[PDB]
Amino acid sequence: QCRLRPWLEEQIQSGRYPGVQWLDQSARVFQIPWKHAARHGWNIDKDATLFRNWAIHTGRYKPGIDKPDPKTWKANFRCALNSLTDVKELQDAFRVYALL
DNA sequence: TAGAAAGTGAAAGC
DNA sequence: GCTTTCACTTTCTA
């Protein structure tokens, strides 16, 4: 309910993170936007929200008290996601995963 | 074109 | 149940 997989599965379905969405509802496949922060269009508030929320959710980021750290948010999220043994990255700017 | 700023997996950490 | 660190590897933009 508050672990990465149920939390992510929930974030996906919310449809509030633009770009985060299902590609197959029944094999449990979804994509996460993965824009490079060094890119021209990139901006903290539209490309790092999902990563940021994961930090808020796990207490790693407290808004107002901490200085933003999207690099860390991105890397923390990617290592927590990769640590899950019941999620797979389909190595086919996005990343595509399957909930097993 | 280039180095700085991102980004990365994997082992070590709590 | 993931987070941090580490020793490198990438993506940029101009």
- A96 to A30, A87, A88: CA distances (angstroms): 6, 11, 9
Q: Is A8 exposed, middle or buried (0-12, 13-18, 19+ CB in 10 A)?
A: buried
DSSP A66: S
Number of domains in chain A: 1
CA→C1' distance for A19 and C14 (Å): 29
Q: A76 to each of A2, A25, A28, A60, how far by Cα in Å?
A: 16, 26, 22, 10
Tokens of A56: 């808020």
| CA distance linking residue A30 with residue A32, whole number of Å | 7
Distance of CA A30 to the CA centre of its chain: 11
Resolution limit, Å: 2.6
* Method underlying the structure: X-ray
Looking from the CA of A71 toward its CB, the CA atoms found within 13 Å total: 2
Q: Is the CB of A27 under 7 A from strand B?
A: no
CATH number at residue A32: 1.10.10.10
Hey, what are A74's tokens?
């991105």
Q: Residue A78 is part of which domain span?
A: 4-99
Q: Within 7 Å: CB of A3 and strand B?
A: no
